[PDB]
Amino acid sequence: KVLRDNIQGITKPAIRRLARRGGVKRISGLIYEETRGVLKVFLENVIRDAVTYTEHAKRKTVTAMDVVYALKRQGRTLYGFGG
Amino acid sequence: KVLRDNIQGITKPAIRRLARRGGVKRISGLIYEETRGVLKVFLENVIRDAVTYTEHAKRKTVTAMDVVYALKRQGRTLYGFGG
Amino acid sequence: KRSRKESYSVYVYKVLKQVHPDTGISSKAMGIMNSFVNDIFERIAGEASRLAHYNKRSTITSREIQTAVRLLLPGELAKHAVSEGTKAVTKYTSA
Amino acid sequence: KRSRKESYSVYVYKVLKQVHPDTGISSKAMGIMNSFVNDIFERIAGEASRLAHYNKRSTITSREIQTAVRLLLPGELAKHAVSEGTKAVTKYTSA
Amino acid sequence: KRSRKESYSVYVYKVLKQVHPDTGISSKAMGIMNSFVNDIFERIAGEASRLAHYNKRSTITSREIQTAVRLLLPGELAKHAVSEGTKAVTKYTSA
Amino acid sequence: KPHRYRPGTVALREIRRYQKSTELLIRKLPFQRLVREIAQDFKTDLRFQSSAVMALQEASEAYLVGLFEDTNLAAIHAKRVTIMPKDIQLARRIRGE
Amino acid sequence: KPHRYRPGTVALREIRRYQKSTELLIRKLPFQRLVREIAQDFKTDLRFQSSAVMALQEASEAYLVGLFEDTNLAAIHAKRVTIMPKDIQLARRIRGE
Amino acid sequence: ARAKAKTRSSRAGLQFPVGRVHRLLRKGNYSERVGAGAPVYLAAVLEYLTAEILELAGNAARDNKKTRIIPRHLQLAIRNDEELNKLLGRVTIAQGGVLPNIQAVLLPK
Amino acid sequence: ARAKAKTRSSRAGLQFPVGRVHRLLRKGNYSERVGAGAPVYLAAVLEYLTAEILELAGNAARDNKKTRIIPRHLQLAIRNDEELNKLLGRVTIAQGGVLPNIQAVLLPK
Amino acid sequence: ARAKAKTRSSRAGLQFPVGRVHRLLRKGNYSERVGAGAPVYLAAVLEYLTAEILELAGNAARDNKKTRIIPRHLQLAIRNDEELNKLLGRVTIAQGGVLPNIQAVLLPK
DNA sequence: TAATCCCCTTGGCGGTTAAAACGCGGGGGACAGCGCGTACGTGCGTTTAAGCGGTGCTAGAGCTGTCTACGACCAATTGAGCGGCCTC
DNA sequence: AGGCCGCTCAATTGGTCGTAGACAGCTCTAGCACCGCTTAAACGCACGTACGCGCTGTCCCCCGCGTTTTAACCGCCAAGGGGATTAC
């Protein structure tokens, strides 16, 4: 049940797709692992806040409202998830 | 009564000395006027809020504490003038 | 048995059909609208609380809200909002 | 005389003599630490109000304050703040 | 002993002070306002009378005036004109 | 001969095709597995609302898109189109990361 | 022969000295007159506490030095030692302005 | 005894007199019977039109550093709006003057 | 025996609830006491703001030949207005995508 | 017949005014009731941060052979603690100067 | 905090390509050595208004008495506004 | 979606009761205005010298264009976790 290498679950073509949404034409080989690391750091910060919320809420299920508040505290406020 | 040009009073060597404090080793001659423009925009953004505070305060003399409030609103909180 | 959850659906639906009678809507667009109305509401409310604190006011009035509008809401939208709000408090005092 | 204005001069000075009995302090730096304690007090107070809103709690407790500390304060600052506040609240609980 | 002469004075004054609280009024500009109000009123009223004749309707409702706005007022303003007219009849039926 | 577009043509077609797109660009299941993976390190046996998983997904996607916008602004600033991770680090550190 | 330094040396010495020093680098009184003339652009005949003038000052130079640090970051990212205004415009867009 | 009355202009929340426009329609020989939404609709149209032209006149007055409207401002406001010019192509304005307009061949060089 | 129930939102003539916004401001712990003009002014601001949002959404939908608002229309509505952009620079939209935005260096020739 | 009025800061063994912080939170509009250990915990956190900052300030003053706390010392201390740095990234110190920061590319060969 | 329930999450399974993945031709990309017009740092004297310091004064900042607006709050009552559904 | 049907809560009103700050008004004090001596500022021209970037080239690096494959997706099935709800 333990998971080990799901940062590679965010695939290389998914990175290419996102950069196409970002409007990036040419992408170096060094890009993908750096993107994986920085998204890992960003997710770690957000869910650290969310887990703090959840244990402060005495809950076990991660809710999207906690995601919303965590993104608010990082100045990345998201519309469209019950906020 | 009125004044027409004191944005010139933020002089070019003052900009040079700040860029030395900002770590710039070589400053184009094109730098000074546009730096004046962007500081002009920033000071307008600050002082518009500060004036809004001031007639919200029913006062005619501008205080430093409302300047602190406006800076803290714009995410550029300054220590050393509160209270 | 269920518990009611309040949302701003019918009002945005009303003003949409007021300004565009022929225009439809999707529900997740309404989720973005609910997020918008709560977001801007809390921005204005926090700024109004700040202004009440700064000028030692225990009461937040329309002057506080208008001040918060000039602060947060930029430029042209602020002047329009001032205009219809002044109309709105005027007709409200007449009602 | 004038109206008494509350400041944090003496408590910062007591803490300074706890950490550095030998040194002095400038008044400009003193106003800076007054702004610091007021600013961080405001950050933690607003964050605790946010979390009391999220949990629908009418009362902010040291649980909420600890949550806000774990949010804002980074890493070892957060955990040693937890340790210090825990030791303090045990001493105050034991009077 | 004199007799009252009616004009559109205070209404245009109210509207101007709504859109410009600090702007003053010259009297012959106000004459141009009164004459403009009378002119456009007579144009739209005559068009409504003609439309009432052509549809054989002895009653001129808001639909006739809406048609008259669509005819005389060109485009973009006419679209906005329909907007306040719809909102006004809605709020009038609600009041 | 088989048809072959010049390098960048299919890239630009992907540019237009994914700017007109609105859908998520990540496979849902491995992203959910990754958020469970990372969150298990901070707290054990964590359960995720799937809507929260897609919320994290879309927020992260748009955060990355804003990051690459800053990046390729730096790249056209750097007279390049092959973006490299120092561009991303520049965007982060000027942003304050 | 009178003594003369190579380019950048006095620039670097100034860099070191005002990184060491903490004082204001702009004359306070033209700054004050600028504050008043932009005040009357919003409300005429305003009066300013001197503390408000210097508070606006240290805020102004702090904002400026932050922008110039970002400018140097862009310029070394532009592989350069001389900054041009497009660096500042880039950094202003990166900060979200 | 009686309910306290509000004007129908106040019921609309509009500044133009709904009653006066209604009576000038009914006595203007356009129809003997008039639907209820017609004068409030027309009055809202008129108030919006005057609001727009008064806004234009006010901005024009602030351009000329004059606090009060003058019919020169009215001439500048009418003639520099395309749809208002379409409304008032054949309308003469007292003491208004004309647009500053010099043809290209009239200018030197 | 009792006054007729006629809501303050109808007193404003506005669809946004005076009562609900008032109770959210009072419950939101900003001050224990709130001036009367504050929630009506706020509700007028909110309904107006949502009004231009709905205008831009409507023209965005009419451009893409759909009668219903999609959040892609919301993306095009928000990001194409400079004051709305200044309002929502840091705000993220679900399933909105981005603006159609290509730099000129990416085009051929 | 009341006993000695003791102080809650000394009850916590601490220096920061518990009564002031509790009164400010009662008057700060964050919750109408405040938990009993909340201001004690808050003051403990504030004193811990203040104590470590003043320790760093005194050490920095001793580093430049001065015996008095200076805002330059505050800058050189807080901006050189990375967790205090990103705790206080957007905060300006009056007359604090800047960190000595030369880029390695700016230094000569 | 106890109960609890139910519904919403979690794990398992069967195919199906969609998506990933791997590999190969190829044009483009990045960018350095050197060159070359260049663009600005640095010297340093001169000007002047900033800086310092020195006076007079009242505008309004700030503090004090009144008082009435002003608005929160409770029982009741209602009407709008949300849960539910189905359907075109 | 939306529009229609059933519920319910919330929103208001009348009054009441406490109180907040607006207003008047004094006062006194620092901002403003005026005045005077000094020299830092500053700035402007000359000149030394280093800057930015482009040509050509150069080396190599993903992009595009496929094939293969596999597990993601979708549809289906069984479990119970816990979240939320009511009462104490």
Residue numbers in the entry:
A (entry chain L), B (entry chain P): 20 to 102
C (entry chain R), D (entry chain N), E (entry chain H): 30 to 124
F (entry chain K), G (entry chain O): 37 to 133
H (entry chain G), I (entry chain Q), J (entry chain M): 10 to 118
Question: Please, what does the article write about this entry?
Answer:
In all structures, nucleosomes 1 and 3 form a canonical stack, whereas nucleosome 2 is located in a DNA loop between the two stacking nucleosomes and is rotated relative to the nucleosome stack. H1 is absent from the stacked nucleosomes of the 4×177 array, but is present on nucleosome 1 in the 4×187 and 4×197 arrays, and is present on both stacked nucleosomes in the 4×207 array. Particularly high Δβ values are found for entry DNA at nucleosome 3, except for the 4×207 array, which is the only array where H1 is observed on nucleosome 3. In summary, as the NRL increases, nucleosome 2 moves farther away from the stacked nucleosomes and the trajectories of linker DNA at nucleosomes 1 and 3 progressively approach canonical values (Δβ = ~0).
Here, we report cryo-EM structures of human H1-containing tetranucleosome arrays with four physiologically relevant NRLs. The structures show a zig-zag arrangement of nucleosomes, with nucleosomes 1 and 3 forming a stack. H1 binding to stacked nucleosomes depends on the NRL, whereas H1 always binds to the non-stacked nucleosomes 2 and 4. H1 contacts DNA with L1, the amino-terminal part of α2 together with L3, and α3 to stabilize the nucleosome and contribute to chromatin compaction.
